[PDB]
Amino acid sequence: ALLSFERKYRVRGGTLIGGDLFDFWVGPYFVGFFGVSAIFFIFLGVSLIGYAASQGPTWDPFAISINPPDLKYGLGAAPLLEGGFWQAITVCALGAFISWMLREVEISRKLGIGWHVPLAFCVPIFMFCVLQVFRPLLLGSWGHAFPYGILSHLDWVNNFGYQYLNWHYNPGHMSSVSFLFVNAMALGLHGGLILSVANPGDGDKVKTAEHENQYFRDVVGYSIGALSIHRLGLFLASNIFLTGAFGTIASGPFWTRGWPEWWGWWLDIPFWS
Amino acid sequence: ADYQTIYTQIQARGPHITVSGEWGDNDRVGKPFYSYWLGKIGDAQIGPIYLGASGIAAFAFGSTAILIILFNMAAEVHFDPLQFFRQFFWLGLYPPKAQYGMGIPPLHDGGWWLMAGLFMTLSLGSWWIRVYSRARALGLGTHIAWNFAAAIFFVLCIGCIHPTLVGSWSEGVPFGIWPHIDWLTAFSIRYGNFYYCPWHGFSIGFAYGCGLLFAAHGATILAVARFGGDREIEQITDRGTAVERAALFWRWTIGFNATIESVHRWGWFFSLMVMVSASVGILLTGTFVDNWYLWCVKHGAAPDYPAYLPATPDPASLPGAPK
Amino acid sequence: YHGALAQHLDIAQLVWYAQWLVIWTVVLLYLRREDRREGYPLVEPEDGQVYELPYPKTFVLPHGGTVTVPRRRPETRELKLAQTDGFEGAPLQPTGNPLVDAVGPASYAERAEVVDATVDGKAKIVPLRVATDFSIAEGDVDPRGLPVVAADGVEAGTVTDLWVDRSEHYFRYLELSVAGSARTALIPLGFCDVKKDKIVVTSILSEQFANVPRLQSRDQITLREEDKVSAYYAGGLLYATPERAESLL
Amino acid sequence: CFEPPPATTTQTGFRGLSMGEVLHPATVKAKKERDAQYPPALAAVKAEGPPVSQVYKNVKVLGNLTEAEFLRTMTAITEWVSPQEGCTYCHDENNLASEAKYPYVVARRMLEMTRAINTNWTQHVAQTGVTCYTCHRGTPLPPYVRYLEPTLPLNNRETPTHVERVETRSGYVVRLAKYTAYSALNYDPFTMFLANDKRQVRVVPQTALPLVGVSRGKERRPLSDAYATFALMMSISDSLGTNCTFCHNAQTFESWGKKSTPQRAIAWWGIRMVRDLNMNYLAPLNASLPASRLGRQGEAPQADCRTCHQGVTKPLFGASRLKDYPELGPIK
Ligand code: BCB
Ligand code: BCB
Ligand code: BCB
Ligand SMILES: C/C=C1/c2cc3[nH]c4c(c3C)C(=O)[C@H](C(=O)OC)c4c3nc(cc4[nH]c(cc(n2)[C@@H]1C)c(C(C)=O)c4C)[C@@H](C)[C@@H]3CCC(=O)OC/C=C(/C)CCC[C@H](C)CCC[C@H](C)CCCC(C)C
Ligand SMILES: C/C=C1/c2cc3[nH]c4c(c3C)C(=O)[C@H](C(=O)OC)c4c3nc(cc4[nH]c(cc(n2)[C@@H]1C)c(C(C)=O)c4C)[C@@H](C)[C@@H]3CCC(=O)OC/C=C(\C)CCC[C@H](C)CCC[C@H](C)CCCC(C)C
Ligand SMILES: CC(C)=CCC/C(C)=C/CC/C(C)=C/CC/C(C)=C/CC/C(C)=C/CC/C(C)=C/CC/C(C)=C/CC1=C(C)C(=O)c2ccccc2C1=O
Ligand code: HEC
């Protein structure tokens, strides 16, 4: 069960709810109170999905879709076939994600480490709510949310974009994309570097921090240092959704025209019109 | 509340360490200068900067490309420089509009485009050499150099390989802010929705994975900042408690874990696979697939949804309809 | 058709399989083995345990030495804990005082009893009394002089020196004299809230500054010592007062 | 910057596909009031006496009608086209058969055009139809027209800036951008697609694999056409005050059936009507128009989607006068 160094860290303590009644492991998995509530929601969710999937047409996992209701049903419940199952699943998902995040908190306490990971994981849970909850509330309909299916959800993204003519010109999107791209570059640069230091090969000597920082000063004239790149990484990645959320929320509630046209504020200033 | 994870509380100035290259220590230039606000989230020290043959070769070709692009961009606003600033985003240097095949197009129809691309390509080449040579000079793995090669190969794929394989310079990416963007939609439209290209999907997967991984890794190292987790090279060669706990967090969460080294392999690999996956898709596009949607349909992948409004036959194919 | 083959087989279709193959290959046969270089093989010949590991690699350390991984390397130290239950996955229960016994979050890795070094060969982590040419920055607090306040709102000591990282230009520890025990403790800046009139440390109580690990010299620190020290205060997070183990809600 | 909530939404494709309209209601109300200025139908007339073809001298098109009926027509034409200028605009005070003024001859052709639309393009204009108003909106120059180059502003009732003026070549990029809903798309979808039937709109392959003999080098179309098609589609969208999903499910723009709305059909007929209008009726009026009407290559003003729609998915929100003026189509 145990790694060569694991046993010493496996003490009781650091729970949020329910003392040492759920303070134990199952193989490698810490089972918190949330460990339990996570599994509960996952079970329900995965059940609901299969039950809804059987009431639908195909079984090719690519072509399965659980869609939300027509727009007419507003912010109400809907029949289980015609969008309710989606509503159910949506809740089970939020159950599971929040449970997952809080379980990470419990683990973080038992090791005496920072809660930086559960924190960071709030970013994607947040964005999920922006798509599936907040924006739908603002347009008064659950039907504005996205269907659960492997390829089906891509067609929702597809049309949602083209509803605003050329979604590439959404300024919140431009930010979001820009962060996606730079974060991937950074990750290669980083992972690259750390390996480039430990693994120069030809049984040549293992290098130093000084070397790391020398490499980047040489190439691009600055080096941010070791701790800072992790802070920066977290920052970059987290802003993919933190900025993109503004972009998403804008579309519909605070903007109904083509996104390219929004750049009229600049183009059509009188001073150069 | 480890505040050191957020910003450096007490900064520390000190004398500038210089690690010695196998070559070109004389080609380092500029005076180091420290910087207090920058030093609150990062290293305060800016400069000096190595400045090799490769590095200078890059600045040369890079500028010749930029100048070509910009002179063309001026010409689009018949040189009135107020409209140049107003309209900047909308301006560009387009490849051929007309079909010349692989024929070298005239300058007034994307020859200037072709030109700028050559020089941009040479620029990326010499810059690659820098990123490689500097690693070899300081006695370091060439890992960064390879990731970057993938990136450069992807750029060649979209901007000249793919054009070559189908045989038209017309399928090149324009230079211009909005016009390099407008390419993406005209390209995807043409090849039957890029959402149905599996290589697009693979690319996006690794791209979103890079998000997931850095978010998580960064967060982790910060969580174990107090036990020295940021000193990664030593935690490799002599496992400390930082990375013991880091590993145990993840094992107890998701059932398996990495080592402090291997996570950087995972990251490096994921980064690299965005560009690889992308390249494959572009190479297959046009050459061995004309319509990614219908290809997905051919292989039974595509969804179908029922009609909301009445289904609508193509009026082109009705009896005695117009041209 | 460009890219067709016998009976509704096209190239893009094969490449699909190829891609997937490549991924799983790299992921399972490479990356996941690489993930086993520390911690393995696991605990309570044998077939699975040989297959899961990679061919060892040897690090050619910068200042002499080589480290090879994976390697057999287990906890010699007698851990001061007992079984909460029979159950194999049940937790452990510290029997002594956990902060000193060095368990749970106060555990330290058996790192080298070796002073971490710079590129040129000197000690990396040292106080300012030694590294005189490193200053504090023009703008930031100089904590030398300031009082250290513990989680029980009590003055526990006076800051006497910062310990700089010479390879990275970053302070890693404050040194402080413990009130009424003529001795000098290190504390990592992680656990330090640096205000202008004081340093605040909510990780441990005043009285626990007593038993912060002592070092070999008082002018350098070994990689292990660093672990022992940091581990201490973090162990505080769960243990410093009985109410921190117990569930917050 | 940003328009306040709420927004009206509609649904045009199956649930969960984010297909449908998005309208800031203020913007719609503004257009509703504009479009409501359509003058109502004059009360109908006693149909008494001979046909006007045995009465007035120079009556070619409307010779079918009675005198009462015919003047009711002439009165409404004046309302719709030259309300401010009066009957005087097309006629000589002292001779109503005089064709000396150019607007007389054009108005004759315009009658023929308007009848033609309501009779031969019922596949588009339907039960609703058009009148002179649909296009003209009470000026003899319809506010929304196209020359063979981009022109700004789109409404010719507003006075242009220096840059907006077609003369000024700095502003070419912006003139074009604003026909294409602010995109850097570098094609004039009017002259390419709507001025004549010379060019084919569809760009996407109908096979999954590339067919041999149309797929390599000069035998294949340039990507430029795909930019161009998109540009036309940006333009069409904005000319109706709607988006892509009004007409297609983005999954496949290229596919019809249940990947398209009935409105995509109607739009298709719209393109073909618009062409027949420009080529056979509107473009050849450079014969009759003064040079102060013509563009910079002697082209008449021609018509685009906007000319009629003016940012509404149905022109004048589907208001008809067709029952009220049978003389403007359809004809038996
Ligand atoms: C025509 C369609 C367009 C479009 C339409 C579009 C829309 C409508 C939206 C975006 C958005 C975004 N687009 Mg996109 N886009 C992007 C990139 C992006 C992303 C950076 C950004 C955020 C995606 C997101 O919200 O994930 C969300 C992911 C989430 C919420 C994941 C949550 C994870 C969850 C908490 C955990 C899940 C657990 C699992 C179920 C567990 C199962 C696993 C197993 C192991 C147990 C690029 C790089 C391009 C390019 C190259 O052109 C592009 C083009 C387009 N976008 C087209 C022009 N885009 C979004 C945005 O931010 O807009 C500005 C957005 O709303
Ligand atoms: C507005 C932006 C949207 C978007 C746009 C988008 C695009 C354009 C593309 C994807 C693709 C994908 N998206 Mg998606 N997406 C997905 C999941 C997925 C996967 C099916 C796939 C690749 C994910 C990946 O590698 O990420 C990084 C995470 C990794 C590598 C960890 C492993 C996760 C594993 C791959 C997830 C498997 C998901 C399960 C099949 C679903 C759960 C099953 C149940 C029974 C537990 C989830 C679970 C969610 C949620 C809950 O919010 C989501 C939201 C969105 N996506 C938004 C709606 N997505 C790609 C695809 O190929 O389409 C199918 C793709 O091209
Ligand atoms: C309608 C438009 C579509 C579209 C069209 C599109 C196309 C045509 C292509 C992609 C591709 C891709 N799309 Mg995209 N897409 C993506 C995401 C992605 C990327 C992950 C992927 C790879 C591109 C990349 O990383 O380049 C960022 C990295 C680059 C460009 C490399 C740069 C390296 C170089 C060294 C840079 C150096 C700069 C110079 C030094 C500066 C100097 C230059 C001067 C001299 C001029 C998301 C997440 C979404 C969503 C959610 O909707 C989406 C939707 C769409 N894409 C729509 C369906 N997409 C690519 C792909 O993988 O397809 C198979 C691709 O070819
Ligand atoms: C998944 C894989 C990712 C990836 C990977 C990698 N990408 C790398 C490496 C790796 C591994 C390198 O090692 C190399 C590098 O060196 O970085 C440290 C590099 C590059 N990736 C750049 C840009 C980029 N990557 C993009 C994308 C992805 N990348 C994908 C996502 C995109 C997008 C999203 O479009 C963009 C815009 C440039 C910064 C650079 C080339 C410069 C050049 O060829 O110059 C050519 C000549 C010029 C005149 C241009 C120079 C101007 C630039 C902006 C800055 C020059 C620095 C200057 C000297 C600063 C001095 C100031 C100082 C005194 C204070
Ligand atoms: C900028 C921020 C980034 C970021 C950050 C982080 N990400 C983290 C952490 C951080 C920090 C972790 O700590 C945590 C983790 O443990 O590390 C692996 C985690 C995780 N990131 C996962 C997926 C992931 N991250 C994505 C994106 C980003 N992450 C962005 C980029 C994306 C996409 C789509 O991009 C995906 C798919 C899981 C693997 C894991 C949650 C496990 C879970 O929650 O278990 C509990 C839940 C389950 C096991 C299944 C629940 C099934 C429900 C009930 C029913 C169906 C659900 C759904 C409605 C189906 C839709 C259909 C679909 C086909 C459309
Ligand atoms: C059956 C039952 C009743 C069980 C009860 C117990 C219970 C609640 C169990 C949970 C069961 C469940 C739901 C298990 C599923 C677990 C999940 C969600 C697994 C998904 C894992 C995925 C897809 C990860 C994608 C990211 C990825 C590519 C990771 C590979 C690399 C790894 C392992 C990174 C994690 C990692 C990072 C990020 C470091 O920075 C780091 C630094 C130093 C040392 C180690 C690490 C480290 O391991
Ligand atoms: C232009 C847009 C016109 C306006 C405004 C008015 N009239 Fe007109 N008129 C116009 C045309 C093109 C024609 C010929 C129609 C045809 O069928 O060929 C006419 C004809 C007449 C006539 C018949 C007299 C004759 O040509 O012998 C009359 C009596 C007449 N018009 C009167 C009239 C009045 C009273 C108007 C204001 C109420 C008016 N017209 C406006 C073109 C246009």
Ligand code: HEC
């Ligand atoms: C859009 C499909 C139109 C409809 C329906 C009608 N007209 Fe029109 N007209 C249209 C254009 C694009 C133009 C060219 C621009 C121009 O004004 O020359 C015209 C022109 C005229 C004119 C000439 C006016 C002038 O040059 O000042 C007249 C007199 C006129 N049109 C009258 C007219 C009548 C009576 C119509 C209904 C029977 C009618 N037009 C319909 C566009 C369109």
Ligand code: HEC
């Ligand atoms: C209706 C009022 C439409 C709106 C709004 C949009 N499109 Fe469209 N599109 C429409 C028609 C009638 C046609 C066929 C034209 C013909 O002459 O046959 C099209 C065509 C396309 C295509 C080409 C499809 C092909 O077969 O190659 C594309 C790529 C396309 N349309 C895309 C598109 C986009 C992105 C839109 C929003 C900007 C959009 N269309 C709007 C009808 C209508």
Ligand code: HEC
């Ligand atoms: C004046 C002669 C017109 C021109 C030029 C264009 N359109 Fe049109 N359109 C016109 C009418 C009178 C109507 C009546 C529809 C009704 O039944 O009330 C329409 C309708 C449409 C529609 C249908 C809208 C719906 O049912 O919701 C569409 C989609 C449409 N028109 C599109 C369209 C396009 C793309 C055009 C340029 C190619 C275009 N129209 C020109 C009148 C006129």
Ligand SMILES: CC(C)=CCC/C(C)=C/C=C/C(C)=C/C=C/C(C)=C/C=C\C=C(C)\C=C\C=C(/C)CC/C=C(/C)CCCC(C)C
């Ligand atoms: C030998 C034969 C004859 C020729 C073939 C040679 C060859 C390989 C040609 C062409 C190759 C390629 C790969 C062309 C690809 C072009 C691509 C991918 C262009 C993509 C993006 C372009 C953009 C974003 C252009 C922006 C232009 C500007 C901002 C103007 C220039 C000014 C600048 C300040 C540069 C800033 C760029 C950015 C970091 C903000």
Ligand SMILES: CCCCCCCCCCCC[N+](C)(C)[O-]
């Ligand atoms: C295709 C790119 C060609 C550009 C060539 C110019 C760069 C020359 C670099 C010299 C390398 C010197 N070296 C080996 C010591 O690093």
Ligand SMILES: CCCCCCCCCCCC[N+](C)(C)[O-]
């Ligand atoms: C769509 C992109 C592909 C990414 C696939 C990588 C997922 C990680 C696989 C982890 C395997 C876990 N385990 C227990 C089998 O080792």
Ligand SMILES: *C(=O)[C@H](CCSC)NC=O
């Ligand atoms: C593919 O285009 C195919 C080629 C026949 S000969 C090589 N055309 C017939 O389907």
Ligand SMILES: [Fe+2]
């Ligand atoms: Fe790292």
